[PDB]
Structure 1
C-alpha cells in the first residue's frame, strides 16, 4: 500500500542532506525521494521566487501525483510546515507523517509560535541568533562571520564538514508564516515524531511542547542525536522510518 517515501529538507538545506539515508530506505524496498523544494536549487531564483506554500511544496506534490501507491512524508526542522500543508491538500496520497525534530503546529498555528520567544517552552534562540534577515526581511541567511559556531550548532552530527550540495544561501520566509491548514480527513493520518534529544537548534523542551499541543495522538521515537540525525545515525534513522512505513497505523 505504501510504495514511496519522501524526505523533505529544512531551512537553508537541500534534498541531498539525506544522502546517507536514501540507500538505506531503498534496501527496505521503498522508492525514495529527497526533492529540493522551490527555491532550493541554485539557478531557480532563490528565496524571492517562492510565491506561497502551494508553490513552495510543488516538487513534492509532483512526486505524489506519480506515486504508484501511498507515500510517507518526512519533514526535518522547518520541513514539517510543508508536510502538514501537503497532508491537508493530498490526504488521498499520504499514508503517514514523520516529524523529525520538526515543526509540528496545531491547525491554525504558524511555526513562528515556537521559533519566537514565548511560554510555555517556546523559542529557538540559537537559530535566531545565527540566522539573520536579508532583503528587507524577505530572506533568511546564516551568519557566516561565526562559522565554527554555525557548525557546532547546526552540523555537529556530521563526522568531521558537509558538502556544498547540502545547502543554499538564502531561505524564503514563506513557510515560517503560513498556518497549518490541516482539517478533517487529514487529521486521521498517523503521525510520528522522531525526537532529537540533544538538539540545541530545536531544544527537546520545545520538541515535546509541540507534541503536547497538537490535537490528537502523536507517536514518539527518541534518538540520542542533535540537530541532524541523518548525519550521525542514518541506520537507526532509516530503521525507525521504515518500521513506520511498514505499518503507520499500527506502529
Structure 2
C-alpha cells in the first residue's frame, strides 16, 4: 500500500540536502521525493512569499495527490512542523510519519514552545544564537560572521562544506507560529522518532521531551549523530526509513 516516501527539509535548507539518501531508498523499491517547500526555491520569491502553512506545504500535497498508493512523510528539524500539518490534511494519503531529530508538538502546541527557553527541557540556544531576525523580523537568516561556528553546529555531519544547492538565504517564520492542528484520523497515523543523540542544535534532552509531551505512542530509533543524520549515516538512516515504510504499524 505504501508507494511513496517524501523527505522534507528543515529551516534554511533545501530538498537537495537529502541526496545521499534518495538513491538508497529508491533501491528498496519506493518512489522517493525530496521537494523544496514554498519559498525554498531560488527565484520563487523568497521568505516573504509564503502566506501560511497550507501555502508552505502545498508542494508536498501536490505530490501526495499524485501518489499511486500510500506515502510516508519524513521531516527534519523544523520540517517536523510540516509533516504534522500535512498529516492532518491528508491522513487518507499518508501511512506513517518520521520525525528525524525534528520538532514534534502535541496538538495546539507551536514549534516555538521548544525552540524558546522553557521548563522543562525546552529550547535551542545554539540555534537562536546563530539564526537572527531579518526583514523587520519576518524572516530568519544565519549569522555569516561566524562561518566555522555555523559549520560545527549544523554541518558537522558532512564528511570533511555542504553544497550551495542545499541551503537558502532566508527562511519564513510561518511554520514557527502555526500550531500543530492534528486531530482525529490524523492521530491514528503511526509515528516514529529518529533522534540524533549528539545533536546540539536540537539537543537529545529536547528531543525526548517532545516525544514525552506528545499524546499517544511514538516509536523511537536512535542514531549516534550530529544535527544531520543524512549527511553522516545515509545508509543507517535509509534502512530505518525503509523498515518503517515496509510495515509502519508493527515497527
TM-score class, shorter-chain normalisation, is: over 0.9
Structure-2 separation of matches of 1:182 and 1:123: 22
Task: Please provide the CA RMSD for this pair.
Answer: 0.3
Partner of 1:41: 41
SS at match of 1:80: helix
Deviation per CA, 1:108-138, whole angstroms, max 9, x where unpaired? 0000000000000001000000000001110
Structure-2 separation of matches of 1:78 and 1:156: 18
Structure-1 separation of matches of 2:216 and 2:226: 26
TM-score, length-normalised on structure 1? Answer: 1.00
Structure-2 separation of matches of 1:215 and 1:165: 37
CA apart distance, 1:160 = 1.1
Structure-2 separation of matches of 1:110 and 1:36: 22
Structure-1 separation of matches of 2:123 and 2:99: 18
SS at match of 1:157: coil
Q: Which blocks of at least 5 consecutive residues in structure 1 are unaligned?
A: none
Structure-2 separation of matches of 1:29 and 1:195: 25
Structure-2 separation of matches of 1:148 and 1:80: 26
SS at match of 2:25: helix
Deviation per CA, 1:55-104, whole angstroms, max 9, x where unpaired? 00000000000000000000000000000000000000000000000000
Structure-2 separation of matches of 1:82 and 1:111: 10
CA apart distance, 1:45 = 0.4
Partner of 2:75: 75
TM-score, length-normalised on structure 2? Answer: 1.00
CA apart distance, 1:195 = 0.5
Deviation per CA, 1:149-186, whole angstroms, max 9, x where unpaired? 00000000101111000000000000000000000110
4+ residue runs over 4 A deviation:
none
